[PDB]
Design a protein around this ligand. Structure first.
Ligand code: M7M
Lengths: 70, 139, 94, 126
RNA sequence: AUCCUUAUGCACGGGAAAUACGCAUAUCAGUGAGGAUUCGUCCGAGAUUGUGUUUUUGCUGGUU
């Protein structure tokens, strides 16, 4: 189900196998926080870091090497 | 092409030959518009980096500096002329003129061998060398 | 390339300094004759040129902030591996 | 130090931490150890664990706070040690580690260090 | 006091390999690297990127 998500298929095809793993962990981190969180008050904020990292990290994989002096 | 620098006076030619003690000084004599003087300007530019450690390259135009036309006798679109310690070097490509170079060489690799051969033979004071591949038939 | 920068000669001939070794009526008439013949007797740029005018618009800050050296095939890595694979040889056993 | 995290509990002192981290590493070399959260969470579900060590100053702490509630159901002791960087070293890792679970082998060489430390840890859970 | 276990250090003796061993004012990385799957789940530490040397490194001896 995760494979069909947004944070994966918005990226080139080469970086898919690196982005499941990178996202699947942060899902479980997110899900562990949700259990922890009190029912009356639920606060997001953890997600913001975990998207920021993910989008920024996915860019870097795609970017590719700087060119080399011959 | 913009990789490789150009020499705008005959006085830039002569100092450039002198000041480079340890490396070949390779010069293409010919004029920008030419069909064949553009092609060589490519095959050199690609090679110039690989070779920076034993050879230095420059570009000169017969029209910009015509001072050198009679002494080295320059005819045709372009001539490649190799210098080491002010001594004009010389190689037989099987073509029937041992001075300079005329024809357009085909591969990057076969061009690097010739430079390397000239340098190695040259280092020993030898005035003639032999191009391993002899393109008399070609040109 | 320090000399390349400087720009000034002595009022000096090129051949001599290094130590160099080398390894009007008729004319007028000819010119006239030639003329009597001239009287008698690109695409790529067009394709593009039209784009080049299009460029004019772009700002000088943008001209600067242009990404510089992007490789998309990882050519360098593959080439190195190939050289390493092809380096030496070995002798075949008896 | 910094303000030790109020949710951190039991928090081992200085003298127990030396005794615990030493056991950790002593198990690392027999590969009876398991490092990290998920690796530790796996252990409890299977039922092989001896005790869990956690990092107290794990930032944010909520990411490991599920372990305590799982440990209490499987009846497995646990404690926090004051830094993650120290726990990273003991597991044989360059880099910070927030949790670790020693496991069971009852033929083991170190068996008697472990029962020693669990005995000490279960005291802290009052 | 003997004995036994693991880790690390110096070391005699015995082997195998150098297409192998490193290095970086550099990117991430148990807050999960990279894989396996009988599809239920299972292993858990390096992967990128640039680079140096690599039919050899130092050192002696014979014979001309
Ligand atoms: O070898 P040495 O006699 O020098 O030992 P020390 O003089 O350093 O002194 C006291 C320590 O002796 C050891 N011994 C000695 N014996 C006979 C002995 C020891 N230990 C034990 N156990 C503790 C099981 N049993 C013994 O019969 C101890 O290390 C003493 O500290």
């Amino acid at each position: 189900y995760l494979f069909a998500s947004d944070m994966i298929q918005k990226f080139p095809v080469s970086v898919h196998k690196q982005m499941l793993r990178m996202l699947c962990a942060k899902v479980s981190l997110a899900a562990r926080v949700d259990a922890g969180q009190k029912n009356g008050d639920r606060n997001t904020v953890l997600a913001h870091k975990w998207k920021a990292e993910l989008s920024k990290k996915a860019r870097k994989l795609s970017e590719a090497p700087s060119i080399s002096e011959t | 092409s913009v990789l490789l620098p150009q020499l705008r006076t005959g006085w830039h030619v002569d100092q450039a030959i002198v000041t480079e003690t340890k490396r070949l000084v390779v010069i293409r004599f010919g004029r920008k518009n030419d069909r064949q003087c553009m092609i060589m300007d490519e095959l050199l530019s690609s090679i110039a980096e690989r070779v920076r450690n034993f050879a230095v390259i420059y570009l000169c135009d017969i029209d910009e500096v015509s001072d050198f036309d009679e002494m080295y006798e320059l005819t045709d679109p372009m001539t490649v002329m190799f210098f080491y310690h002010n001594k004009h070097m010389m190689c037989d490509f099987g073509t029937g003129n041992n001075n300079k170079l005329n024809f357009i060489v085909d591969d990057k690799q076969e061009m690097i061998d010739i430079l390397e051969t000239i340098f190695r033979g040259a280092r020993k004071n030898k005035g003639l060398v032999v191009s391993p591949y002899d393109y008399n038939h070609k040109r | 390339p320090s000399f390349l920068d400087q720009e000034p000669p002595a009022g000096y001939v090129p051949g001599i300094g290094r130590g160099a070794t080398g390894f009007k009526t008729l004319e007028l008439k000819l010119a006239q004759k030639k003329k009597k013949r001239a009287n008698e007797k690109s695409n790529v740029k067009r394709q593009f040129a039209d784009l080049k005018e299009s460029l004019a618009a772009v700002t000088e800050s943008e001209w600067m902030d242009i990404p510089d050296a992007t490789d998309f095939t990882r050519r360098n890595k593959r080439n190195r591996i190939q050289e390493q694979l092809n380096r030496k040889t070995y002798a075949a056993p008896d | 130090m910094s303000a030790p995290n109020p949710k951190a509990f039991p928090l081992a002192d200085a003298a127990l931490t030396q005794q615990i981290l030493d056991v950790v590493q002593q198990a690392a070399n027999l590969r009876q150890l398991k490092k990290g959260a998920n690796e530790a969470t796996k252990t409890l579900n299977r039922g092989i664990s001896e005790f869990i060590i956690m990092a107290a100053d794990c930032e944010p702490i909520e990411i490991l706070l599920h372990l305590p509630l799982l440990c209490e159901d499987k009846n497995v002791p646990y404690v926090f040690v004051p830094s993650r960087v120290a726990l990273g070293r003991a597991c044989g890792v360059s880099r910070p580690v927030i949790a670790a679970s020693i496991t069971t082998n009852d033929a083991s060489a170190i068996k008697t260090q472990i029962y020693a430390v669990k005995d000490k840890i279960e005291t802290l859970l009052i």
